[PDB]
Design a protein around this ligand. Sequence first.
Ligand SMILES: [Cl-]
Lengths: 78, 78, 78
Amino acid sequence: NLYFQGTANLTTSLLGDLLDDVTSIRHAVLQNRAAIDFLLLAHGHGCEDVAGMCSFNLSDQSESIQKKFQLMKEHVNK
Amino acid sequence: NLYFQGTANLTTSLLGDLLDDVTSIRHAVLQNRAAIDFLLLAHGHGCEDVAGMCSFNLSDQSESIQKKFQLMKEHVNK
Amino acid sequence: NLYFQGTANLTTSLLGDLLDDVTSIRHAVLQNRAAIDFLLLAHGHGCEDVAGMCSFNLSDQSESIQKKFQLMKEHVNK
Ligand SMILES: [Cl-]
């Protein structure tokens, strides 16, 4: 039981760290895309000239992921 | 038992969301790299002039990850 | 018991793959940011001119994540 609880808690702990890292990376990718679009403007080109550069709507399921994560912690660590 | 099953199902649910987000981010990073390489060309430079810019072969274990994920769901949610 | 062990092992296996992919992606994002900063220099602009471009300190909890992952494997697969 406590062995099970130990496995589950390691998993939530690790997942917490990983989710924060992934959030950080998405943030950075979007900043980078905006920088690229400024450079394209500087060359007299619009974002529509390069595949994907107009798009800032990446998959972002933070809301459902964070809710599930919280439920998981409450479920596991009670 | 159902408590165990509940933990495991929350984990597969969350992981599903996270895998889709990571796929999305890798996609975007590669598009961004291609855009950078077009700009370097515009300046009269090749991708070999900037560290890593020639490389589009990121770690992509989607095939093994997706198989494991499917096995995990079938194993857990039966 | 072995069913539990099977679930847990699938989870560590999948997580191992995913962590390597995320590491790879962060690497790439940082290389891309450096490339963008070289292009900004080429245009006579510093990184402070574009949001986030001076920053190479993304969330990187690889040390704690890798330790937890190793503990998880030892805990689960013993
Ligand atoms: Cl990027």
